[PDB]
Amino acid sequence: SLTVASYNLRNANGSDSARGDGWGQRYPVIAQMVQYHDFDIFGTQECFLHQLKDMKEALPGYDYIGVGRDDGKDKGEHSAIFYRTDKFDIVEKGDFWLSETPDVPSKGWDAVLPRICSWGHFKCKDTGFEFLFFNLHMDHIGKKARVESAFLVQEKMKELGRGKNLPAILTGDFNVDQTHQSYDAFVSKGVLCDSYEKCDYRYALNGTFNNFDPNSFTESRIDHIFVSPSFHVKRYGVLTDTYRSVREAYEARTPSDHFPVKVELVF
Ligand SMILES: [Mg+2]
């Protein structure tokens, strides 16, 4: 019934631009995808502020929440959440760091960089249905930080209902795949389920990371959408959409180095 997504948009850098995967070329395609596949609300990873402004401008009808992970204002990568303003209101929103001091910009446990989870308390403008939407990007080095981040996020899921026990959706780039201990940490308490396992219908012609290679295949999934067990998950899809650029013959290009994960859930 409603469509949610998780999409790592890939931080802008000159090195991509050089290889022909520049942000300026990708982002217009990303935005088209968001509009065509009708994402109602989606978590993004890796955007600098200027990337968020580009996307906001390409997406009339959408707004976003979430602060920079470096200083909690505008600096650094965001775990930004985009949403259609005609479908959802924000009741409350916030951000916490994946660390022992979640309230402030900080690194956690054995991680090498600061990591942020951003969240919204949303209300469906049509049906009044209310829910929590979380979105994060995990550390690549800190294995303990990833396991602890999972328990931390689940604690936050109990604290943030504003008085209710709200159902939760959690998107993100979890860095390691479904065979890891941090994945099991998310699903082991009965508090969240993997959309991939729970969906009525599953369309998955690939895993989620592609490395800007249009010919890659993996069974690994490092981008997940986890939902409270009370959600009906009607459909799960990996979108393998590609655009083309003139070679130096055209060649296939991925809009990001991940594929988006699209989930349809009943509200
Ligand atoms: Mg990346």
Side-chain angles (χ1 to χ4, degrees), residues 198-229:
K198 183 167 161 65
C199 63
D200 292 341
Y201 187 82
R202 172 187 310 141
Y203 179 50
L205 305 176
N206 216 313
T208 70
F209 185 63
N210 68 50
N211 208 32
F212 280 125
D213 180 357
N215 299 102
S216 72
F217 178 82
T218 178
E219 294 174 57
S220 277
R221 307 179 318 264
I222 67 178
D223 308 281
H224 311 284
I225 307 185
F226 292 108
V227 298
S228 302

PDB file of all heavy atoms in Angstrom, residues 198-229:
ATOM      1  N   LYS A 198      10.294 -11.404   4.890  1.00  0.00           N
ATOM      2  CA  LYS A 198       8.916 -11.278   5.365  1.00  0.00           C
ATOM      3  C   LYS A 198       7.922 -11.002   4.223  1.00  0.00           C
ATOM      4  O   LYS A 198       6.722 -11.144   4.394  1.00  0.00           O
ATOM      5  CB  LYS A 198       8.885 -10.169   6.428  1.00  0.00           C
ATOM      6  CG  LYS A 198       7.562  -9.891   7.127  1.00  0.00           C
ATOM      7  CD  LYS A 198       7.810  -9.008   8.345  1.00  0.00           C
ATOM      8  CE  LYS A 198       6.556  -8.303   8.851  1.00  0.00           C
ATOM      9  NZ  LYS A 198       5.542  -9.263   9.374  1.00  0.00           N
ATOM     10  N   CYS A 199       8.425 -10.584   3.070  1.00  0.00           N
ATOM     11  CA  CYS A 199       7.597 -10.079   1.999  1.00  0.00           C
ATOM     12  C   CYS A 199       6.703 -11.183   1.415  1.00  0.00           C
ATOM     13  O   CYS A 199       7.128 -12.310   1.368  1.00  0.00           O
ATOM     14  CB  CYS A 199       8.501  -9.484   0.910  1.00  0.00           C
ATOM     15  SG  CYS A 199       9.596 -10.690   0.136  1.00  0.00           S
ATOM     16  N   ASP A 200       5.465 -10.859   1.017  1.00  0.00           N
ATOM     17  CA  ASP A 200       4.668 -11.782   0.236  1.00  0.00           C
ATOM     18  C   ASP A 200       5.302 -12.087  -1.114  1.00  0.00           C
ATOM     19  O   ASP A 200       5.301 -13.232  -1.541  1.00  0.00           O
ATOM     20  CB  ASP A 200       3.257 -11.245  -0.003  1.00  0.00           C
ATOM     21  CG  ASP A 200       2.431 -11.182   1.270  1.00  0.00           C
ATOM     22  OD1 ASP A 200       2.766 -11.845   2.260  1.00  0.00           O
ATOM     23  OD2 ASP A 200       1.474 -10.421   1.305  1.00  0.00           O
ATOM     24  N   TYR A 201       5.779 -11.068  -1.822  1.00  0.00           N
ATOM     25  CA  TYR A 201       6.382 -11.284  -3.129  1.00  0.00           C
ATOM     26  C   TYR A 201       7.784 -10.684  -3.121  1.00  0.00           C
ATOM     27  O   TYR A 201       7.998  -9.592  -2.562  1.00  0.00           O
ATOM     28  CB  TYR A 201       5.516 -10.646  -4.231  1.00  0.00           C
ATOM     29  CG  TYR A 201       5.997 -10.992  -5.609  1.00  0.00           C
ATOM     30  CD1 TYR A 201       5.648 -12.206  -6.211  1.00  0.00           C
ATOM     31  CD2 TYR A 201       6.773 -10.099  -6.336  1.00  0.00           C
ATOM     32  CE1 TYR A 201       6.097 -12.534  -7.495  1.00  0.00           C
ATOM     33  CE2 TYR A 201       7.243 -10.438  -7.597  1.00  0.00           C
ATOM     34  CZ  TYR A 201       6.902 -11.651  -8.160  1.00  0.00           C
ATOM     35  OH  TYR A 201       7.374 -11.950  -9.391  1.00  0.00           O
ATOM     36  N   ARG A 202       8.734 -11.399  -3.726  1.00  0.00           N
ATOM     37  CA  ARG A 202      10.143 -11.002  -3.701  1.00  0.00           C
ATOM     38  C   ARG A 202      10.729 -10.897  -5.102  1.00  0.00           C
ATOM     39  O   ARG A 202      10.696 -11.850  -5.856  1.00  0.00           O
ATOM     40  CB  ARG A 202      10.972 -11.973  -2.879  1.00  0.00           C
ATOM     41  CG  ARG A 202      12.454 -11.664  -3.008  1.00  0.00           C
ATOM     42  CD  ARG A 202      13.341 -12.699  -2.349  1.00  0.00           C
ATOM     43  NE  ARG A 202      12.890 -12.958  -0.985  1.00  0.00           N
ATOM     44  CZ  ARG A 202      12.886 -14.170  -0.457  1.00  0.00           C
ATOM     45  NH1 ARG A 202      13.336 -15.200  -1.173  1.00  0.00           N
ATOM     46  NH2 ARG A 202      12.436 -14.358   0.771  1.00  0.00           N
ATOM     47  N   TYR A 203      11.202  -9.702  -5.466  1.00  0.00           N
ATOM     48  CA  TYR A 203      11.832  -9.482  -6.769  1.00  0.00           C
ATOM     49  C   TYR A 203      13.274  -9.067  -6.522  1.00  0.00           C
ATOM     50  O   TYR A 203      13.561  -7.904  -6.197  1.00  0.00           O
ATOM     51  CB  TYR A 203      11.113  -8.368  -7.482  1.00  0.00           C
ATOM     52  CG  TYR A 203      11.657  -8.012  -8.846  1.00  0.00           C
ATOM     53  CD1 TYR A 203      11.901  -8.991  -9.808  1.00  0.00           C
ATOM     54  CD2 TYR A 203      11.886  -6.670  -9.185  1.00  0.00           C
ATOM     55  CE1 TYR A 203      12.367  -8.647 -11.075  1.00  0.00           C
ATOM     56  CE2 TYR A 203      12.354  -6.311 -10.443  1.00  0.00           C
ATOM     57  CZ  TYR A 203      12.547  -7.302 -11.391  1.00  0.00           C
ATOM     58  OH  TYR A 203      12.981  -6.948 -12.631  1.00  0.00           O
ATOM     59  N   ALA A 204      14.183 -10.008  -6.660  1.00  0.00           N
ATOM     60  CA  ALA A 204      15.553  -9.735  -6.281  1.00  0.00           C
ATOM     61  C   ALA A 204      16.502 -10.358  -7.292  1.00  0.00           C
ATOM     62  O   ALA A 204      16.960 -11.492  -7.093  1.00  0.00           O
ATOM     63  CB  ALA A 204      15.813 -10.292  -4.886  1.00  0.00           C
ATOM     64  N   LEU A 205      16.776  -9.640  -8.383  1.00  0.00           N
ATOM     65  CA  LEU A 205      17.682 -10.138  -9.430  1.00  0.00           C
ATOM     66  C   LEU A 205      19.176  -9.866  -9.067  1.00  0.00           C
ATOM     67  O   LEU A 205      20.097 -10.167  -9.854  1.00  0.00           O
ATOM     68  CB  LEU A 205      17.344  -9.486 -10.795  1.00  0.00           C
ATOM     69  CG  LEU A 205      15.886  -9.634 -11.277  1.00  0.00           C
ATOM     70  CD1 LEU A 205      15.678  -8.862 -12.590  1.00  0.00           C
ATOM     71  CD2 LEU A 205      15.515 -11.122 -11.407  1.00  0.00           C
ATOM     72  N   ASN A 206      19.416  -9.313  -7.874  1.00  0.00           N
ATOM     73  CA  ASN A 206      20.791  -9.074  -7.436  1.00  0.00           C
ATOM     74  C   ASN A 206      20.736  -8.745  -5.946  1.00  0.00           C
ATOM     75  O   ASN A 206      19.652  -8.465  -5.414  1.00  0.00           O
ATOM     76  CB  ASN A 206      21.357  -7.861  -8.193  1.00  0.00           C
ATOM     77  CG  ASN A 206      22.824  -8.012  -8.525  1.00  0.00           C
ATOM     78  OD1 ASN A 206      23.613  -8.389  -7.665  1.00  0.00           O
ATOM     79  ND2 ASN A 206      23.213  -7.651  -9.769  1.00  0.00           N
ATOM     80  N   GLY A 207      21.922  -8.644  -5.339  1.00  0.00           N
ATOM     81  CA  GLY A 207      22.083  -8.123  -3.986  1.00  0.00           C
ATOM     82  C   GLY A 207      22.210  -6.628  -4.098  1.00  0.00           C
ATOM     83  O   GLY A 207      21.984  -6.076  -5.164  1.00  0.00           O
ATOM     84  N   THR A 208      22.628  -5.951  -3.038  1.00  0.00           N
ATOM     85  CA  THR A 208      22.419  -4.525  -3.000  1.00  0.00           C
ATOM     86  C   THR A 208      23.591  -3.639  -3.369  1.00  0.00           C
ATOM     87  O   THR A 208      23.382  -2.502  -3.729  1.00  0.00           O
ATOM     88  CB  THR A 208      21.825  -4.055  -1.660  1.00  0.00           C
ATOM     89  OG1 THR A 208      22.806  -4.185  -0.638  1.00  0.00           O
ATOM     90  CG2 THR A 208      20.570  -4.915  -1.276  1.00  0.00           C
ATOM     91  N   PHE A 209      24.819  -4.141  -3.258  1.00  0.00           N
ATOM     92  CA  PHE A 209      26.000  -3.388  -3.638  1.00  0.00           C
ATOM     93  C   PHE A 209      26.479  -3.815  -5.039  1.00  0.00           C
ATOM     94  O   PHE A 209      26.567  -5.006  -5.337  1.00  0.00           O
ATOM     95  CB  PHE A 209      27.114  -3.631  -2.625  1.00  0.00           C
ATOM     96  CG  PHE A 209      28.330  -2.804  -2.866  1.00  0.00           C
ATOM     97  CD1 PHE A 209      28.273  -1.412  -2.796  1.00  0.00           C
ATOM     98  CD2 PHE A 209      29.543  -3.417  -3.214  1.00  0.00           C
ATOM     99  CE1 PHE A 209      29.388  -0.647  -3.068  1.00  0.00           C
ATOM    100  CE2 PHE A 209      30.681  -2.660  -3.424  1.00  0.00           C
ATOM    101  CZ  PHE A 209      30.597  -1.275  -3.372  1.00  0.00           C
ATOM    102  N   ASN A 210      26.851  -2.840  -5.868  1.00  0.00           N
ATOM    103  CA  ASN A 210      27.249  -3.113  -7.237  1.00  0.00           C
ATOM    104  C   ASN A 210      28.624  -2.512  -7.632  1.00  0.00           C
ATOM    105  O   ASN A 210      29.190  -2.854  -8.684  1.00  0.00           O
ATOM    106  CB  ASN A 210      26.119  -2.680  -8.200  1.00  0.00           C
ATOM    107  CG  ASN A 210      25.925  -1.169  -8.241  1.00  0.00           C
ATOM    108  OD1 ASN A 210      26.896  -0.439  -8.412  1.00  0.00           O
ATOM    109  ND2 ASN A 210      24.686  -0.691  -8.014  1.00  0.00           N
ATOM    110  N   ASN A 211      29.144  -1.593  -6.814  1.00  0.00           N
ATOM    111  CA  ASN A 211      30.506  -1.047  -7.024  1.00  0.00           C
ATOM    112  C   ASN A 211      30.618  -0.274  -8.356  1.00  0.00           C
ATOM    113  O   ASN A 211      31.695  -0.134  -8.914  1.00  0.00           O
ATOM    114  CB  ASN A 211      31.542  -2.176  -6.952  1.00  0.00           C
ATOM    115  CG  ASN A 211      32.911  -1.696  -6.475  1.00  0.00           C
ATOM    116  OD1 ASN A 211      33.047  -0.745  -5.651  1.00  0.00           O
ATOM    117  ND2 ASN A 211      33.946  -2.347  -6.997  1.00  0.00           N
ATOM    118  N   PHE A 212      29.502   0.282  -8.820  1.00  0.00           N
ATOM    119  CA  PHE A 212      29.463   0.974 -10.087  1.00  0.00           C
ATOM    120  C   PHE A 212      29.732   0.049 -11.248  1.00  0.00           C
ATOM    121  O   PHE A 212      29.910   0.494 -12.363  1.00  0.00           O
ATOM    122  CB  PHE A 212      30.426   2.179 -10.153  1.00  0.00           C
ATOM    123  CG  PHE A 212      29.901   3.417  -9.491  1.00  0.00           C
ATOM    124  CD1 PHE A 212      30.646   4.061  -8.502  1.00  0.00           C
ATOM    125  CD2 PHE A 212      28.662   3.918  -9.822  1.00  0.00           C
ATOM    126  CE1 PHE A 212      30.164   5.219  -7.900  1.00  0.00           C
ATOM    127  CE2 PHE A 212      28.166   5.046  -9.210  1.00  0.00           C
ATOM    128  CZ  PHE A 212      28.927   5.719  -8.269  1.00  0.00           C
ATOM    129  N   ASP A 213      29.699  -1.241 -10.999  1.00  0.00           N
ATOM    130  CA  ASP A 213      29.825  -2.206 -12.083  1.00  0.00           C
ATOM    131  C   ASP A 213      28.405  -2.674 -12.553  1.00  0.00           C
ATOM    132  O   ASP A 213      27.710  -3.336 -11.781  1.00  0.00           O
ATOM    133  CB  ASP A 213      30.599  -3.401 -11.523  1.00  0.00           C
ATOM    134  CG  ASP A 213      30.806  -4.500 -12.540  1.00  0.00           C
ATOM    135  OD1 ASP A 213      30.336  -4.433 -13.701  1.00  0.00           O
ATOM    136  OD2 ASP A 213      31.430  -5.475 -12.157  1.00  0.00           O
ATOM    137  N   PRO A 214      28.019  -2.428 -13.832  1.00  0.00           N
ATOM    138  CA  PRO A 214      26.669  -2.869 -14.303  1.00  0.00           C
ATOM    139  C   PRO A 214      26.540  -4.387 -14.567  1.00  0.00           C
ATOM    140  O   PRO A 214      25.474  -4.853 -15.026  1.00  0.00           O
ATOM    141  CB  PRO A 214      26.463  -2.073 -15.607  1.00  0.00           C
ATOM    142  CG  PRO A 214      27.854  -1.765 -16.076  1.00  0.00           C
ATOM    143  CD  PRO A 214      28.723  -1.615 -14.843  1.00  0.00           C
ATOM    144  N   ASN A 215      27.637  -5.118 -14.351  1.00  0.00           N
ATOM    145  CA  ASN A 215      27.692  -6.578 -14.578  1.00  0.00           C
ATOM    146  C   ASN A 215      27.914  -7.401 -13.321  1.00  0.00           C
ATOM    147  O   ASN A 215      28.081  -8.610 -13.422  1.00  0.00           O
ATOM    148  CB  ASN A 215      28.771  -6.942 -15.592  1.00  0.00           C
ATOM    149  CG  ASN A 215      28.520  -6.309 -16.956  1.00  0.00           C
ATOM    150  OD1 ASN A 215      29.154  -5.281 -17.327  1.00  0.00           O
ATOM    151  ND2 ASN A 215      27.554  -6.864 -17.680  1.00  0.00           N
ATOM    152  N   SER A 216      27.916  -6.762 -12.150  1.00  0.00           N
ATOM    153  CA  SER A 216      28.190  -7.468 -10.904  1.00  0.00           C
ATOM    154  C   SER A 216      27.033  -8.353 -10.482  1.00  0.00           C
ATOM    155  O   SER A 216      25.849  -8.051 -10.754  1.00  0.00           O
ATOM    156  CB  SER A 216      28.529  -6.473  -9.765  1.00  0.00           C
ATOM    157  OG  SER A 216      27.348  -5.771  -9.343  1.00  0.00           O
ATOM    158  N   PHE A 217      27.341  -9.413  -9.746  1.00  0.00           N
ATOM    159  CA  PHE A 217      26.258 -10.129  -9.069  1.00  0.00           C
ATOM    160  C   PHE A 217      26.736 -10.485  -7.698  1.00  0.00           C
ATOM    161  O   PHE A 217      27.922 -10.800  -7.533  1.00  0.00           O
ATOM    162  CB  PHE A 217      25.870 -11.407  -9.817  1.00  0.00           C
ATOM    163  CG  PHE A 217      24.797 -12.202  -9.118  1.00  0.00           C
ATOM    164  CD1 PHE A 217      23.468 -11.859  -9.255  1.00  0.00           C
ATOM    165  CD2 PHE A 217      25.133 -13.347  -8.366  1.00  0.00           C
ATOM    166  CE1 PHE A 217      22.497 -12.603  -8.621  1.00  0.00           C
ATOM    167  CE2 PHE A 217      24.174 -14.080  -7.680  1.00  0.00           C
ATOM    168  CZ  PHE A 217      22.826 -13.724  -7.828  1.00  0.00           C
ATOM    169  N   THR A 218      25.852 -10.409  -6.705  1.00  0.00           N
ATOM    170  CA  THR A 218      26.145 -10.969  -5.388  1.00  0.00           C
ATOM    171  C   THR A 218      24.850 -11.445  -4.723  1.00  0.00           C
ATOM    172  O   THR A 218      23.757 -10.985  -5.075  1.00  0.00           O
ATOM    173  CB  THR A 218      26.947  -9.961  -4.490  1.00  0.00           C
ATOM    174  OG1 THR A 218      27.157 -10.539  -3.199  1.00  0.00           O
ATOM    175  CG2 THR A 218      26.261  -8.610  -4.344  1.00  0.00           C
ATOM    176  N   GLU A 219      24.945 -12.402  -3.794  1.00  0.00           N
ATOM    177  CA  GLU A 219      23.809 -12.718  -2.927  1.00  0.00           C
ATOM    178  C   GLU A 219      23.861 -11.875  -1.633  1.00  0.00           C
ATOM    179  O   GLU A 219      22.987 -11.985  -0.773  1.00  0.00           O
ATOM    180  CB  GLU A 219      23.799 -14.223  -2.572  1.00  0.00           C
ATOM    181  CG  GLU A 219      23.555 -15.161  -3.754  1.00  0.00           C
ATOM    182  CD  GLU A 219      23.699 -16.645  -3.378  1.00  0.00           C
ATOM    183  OE1 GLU A 219      22.991 -17.114  -2.446  1.00  0.00           O
ATOM    184  OE2 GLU A 219      24.526 -17.359  -4.003  1.00  0.00           O
ATOM    185  N   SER A 220      24.900 -11.075  -1.471  1.00  0.00           N
ATOM    186  CA  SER A 220      25.031 -10.298  -0.246  1.00  0.00           C
ATOM    187  C   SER A 220      24.050  -9.168  -0.266  1.00  0.00           C
ATOM    188  O   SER A 220      23.943  -8.460  -1.244  1.00  0.00           O
ATOM    189  CB  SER A 220      26.405  -9.660  -0.167  1.00  0.00           C
ATOM    190  OG  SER A 220      27.327 -10.593   0.336  1.00  0.00           O
ATOM    191  N   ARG A 221      23.409  -8.913   0.855  1.00  0.00           N
ATOM    192  CA  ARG A 221      22.613  -7.705   0.963  1.00  0.00           C
ATOM    193  C   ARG A 221      23.177  -6.904   2.128  1.00  0.00           C
ATOM    194  O   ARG A 221      23.233  -7.426   3.230  1.00  0.00           O
ATOM    195  CB  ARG A 221      21.177  -8.079   1.218  1.00  0.00           C
ATOM    196  CG  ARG A 221      20.631  -9.076   0.196  1.00  0.00           C
ATOM    197  CD  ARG A 221      19.185  -9.471   0.458  1.00  0.00           C
ATOM    198  NE  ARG A 221      18.849  -9.707   1.869  1.00  0.00           N
ATOM    199  CZ  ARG A 221      18.841 -10.904   2.456  1.00  0.00           C
ATOM    200  NH1 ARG A 221      19.246 -11.956   1.785  1.00  0.00           N
ATOM    201  NH2 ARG A 221      18.519 -11.039   3.744  1.00  0.00           N
ATOM    202  N   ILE A 222      23.588  -5.656   1.877  1.00  0.00           N
ATOM    203  CA  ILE A 222      24.193  -4.813   2.915  1.00  0.00           C
ATOM    204  C   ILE A 222      23.288  -3.616   3.181  1.00  0.00           C
ATOM    205  O   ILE A 222      23.530  -2.845   4.116  1.00  0.00           O
ATOM    206  CB  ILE A 222      25.644  -4.325   2.567  1.00  0.00           C
ATOM    207  CG1 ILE A 222      25.668  -3.365   1.397  1.00  0.00           C
ATOM    208  CG2 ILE A 222      26.555  -5.485   2.236  1.00  0.00           C
ATOM    209  CD1 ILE A 222      27.078  -2.852   1.082  1.00  0.00           C
ATOM    210  N   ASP A 223      22.258  -3.469   2.345  1.00  0.00           N
ATOM    211  CA  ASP A 223      21.237  -2.466   2.570  1.00  0.00           C
ATOM    212  C   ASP A 223      19.937  -3.195   2.934  1.00  0.00           C
ATOM    213  O   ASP A 223      19.487  -4.052   2.178  1.00  0.00           O
ATOM    214  CB  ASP A 223      21.051  -1.601   1.325  1.00  0.00           C
ATOM    215  CG  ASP A 223      22.362  -1.028   0.825  1.00  0.00           C
ATOM    216  OD1 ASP A 223      22.829  -0.032   1.418  1.00  0.00           O
ATOM    217  OD2 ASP A 223      22.928  -1.563  -0.159  1.00  0.00           O
ATOM    218  N   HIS A 224      19.345  -2.858   4.083  1.00  0.00           N
ATOM    219  CA  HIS A 224      18.132  -3.504   4.541  1.00  0.00           C
ATOM    220  C   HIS A 224      17.042  -2.508   4.851  1.00  0.00           C
ATOM    221  O   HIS A 224      17.300  -1.324   5.126  1.00  0.00           O
ATOM    222  CB  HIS A 224      18.370  -4.315   5.816  1.00  0.00           C
ATOM    223  CG  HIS A 224      19.544  -5.221   5.744  1.00  0.00           C
ATOM    224  ND1 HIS A 224      19.516  -6.412   5.049  1.00  0.00           N
ATOM    225  CD2 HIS A 224      20.765  -5.151   6.336  1.00  0.00           C
ATOM    226  CE1 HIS A 224      20.712  -6.974   5.121  1.00  0.00           C
ATOM    227  NE2 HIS A 224      21.481  -6.235   5.906  1.00  0.00           N
ATOM    228  N   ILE A 225      15.808  -2.999   4.758  1.00  0.00           N
ATOM    229  CA  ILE A 225      14.662  -2.374   5.404  1.00  0.00           C
ATOM    230  C   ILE A 225      14.064  -3.363   6.427  1.00  0.00           C
ATOM    231  O   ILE A 225      13.508  -4.398   6.052  1.00  0.00           O
ATOM    232  CB  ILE A 225      13.613  -1.951   4.360  1.00  0.00           C
ATOM    233  CG1 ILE A 225      14.301  -1.089   3.277  1.00  0.00           C
ATOM    234  CG2 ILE A 225      12.438  -1.253   5.056  1.00  0.00           C
ATOM    235  CD1 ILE A 225      13.357  -0.499   2.251  1.00  0.00           C
ATOM    236  N   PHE A 226      14.223  -3.037   7.723  1.00  0.00           N
ATOM    237  CA  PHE A 226      13.714  -3.871   8.826  1.00  0.00           C
ATOM    238  C   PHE A 226      12.434  -3.174   9.320  1.00  0.00           C
ATOM    239  O   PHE A 226      12.388  -1.958   9.331  1.00  0.00           O
ATOM    240  CB  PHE A 226      14.730  -3.869   9.970  1.00  0.00           C
ATOM    241  CG  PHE A 226      16.035  -4.568   9.661  1.00  0.00           C
ATOM    242  CD1 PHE A 226      17.208  -3.821   9.478  1.00  0.00           C
ATOM    243  CD2 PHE A 226      16.133  -5.946   9.724  1.00  0.00           C
ATOM    244  CE1 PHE A 226      18.447  -4.434   9.332  1.00  0.00           C
ATOM    245  CE2 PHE A 226      17.368  -6.573   9.512  1.00  0.00           C
ATOM    246  CZ  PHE A 226      18.527  -5.814   9.297  1.00  0.00           C
ATOM    247  N   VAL A 227      11.384  -3.920   9.645  1.00  0.00           N
ATOM    248  CA  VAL A 227      10.092  -3.302  10.008  1.00  0.00           C
ATOM    249  C   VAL A 227       9.603  -4.021  11.272  1.00  0.00           C
ATOM    250  O   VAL A 227       9.882  -5.235  11.465  1.00  0.00           O
ATOM    251  CB  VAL A 227       9.028  -3.435   8.866  1.00  0.00           C
ATOM    252  CG1 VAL A 227       9.478  -2.707   7.571  1.00  0.00           C
ATOM    253  CG2 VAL A 227       8.718  -4.907   8.564  1.00  0.00           C
ATOM    254  N   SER A 228       8.872  -3.318  12.142  1.00  0.00           N
ATOM    255  CA  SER A 228       8.129  -4.044  13.217  1.00  0.00           C
ATOM    256  C   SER A 228       7.337  -5.234  12.680  1.00  0.00           C
ATOM    257  O   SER A 228       6.750  -5.153  11.586  1.00  0.00           O
ATOM    258  CB  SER A 228       7.155  -3.084  13.938  1.00  0.00           C
ATOM    259  OG  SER A 228       7.911  -2.030  14.459  1.00  0.00           O
ATOM    260  N   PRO A 229       7.217  -6.318  13.489  1.00  0.00           N
ATOM    261  CA  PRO A 229       6.437  -7.499  13.034  1.00  0.00           C
ATOM    262  C   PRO A 229       4.972  -7.190  12.764  1.00  0.00           C
ATOM    263  O   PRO A 229       4.359  -7.885  11.972  1.00  0.00           O
ATOM    264  CB  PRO A 229       6.570  -8.533  14.175  1.00  0.00           C
ATOM    265  CG  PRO A 229       7.377  -7.884  15.265  1.00  0.00           C
ATOM    266  CD  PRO A 229       7.833  -6.502  14.819  1.00  0.00           C
TER     267      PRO A 229
END
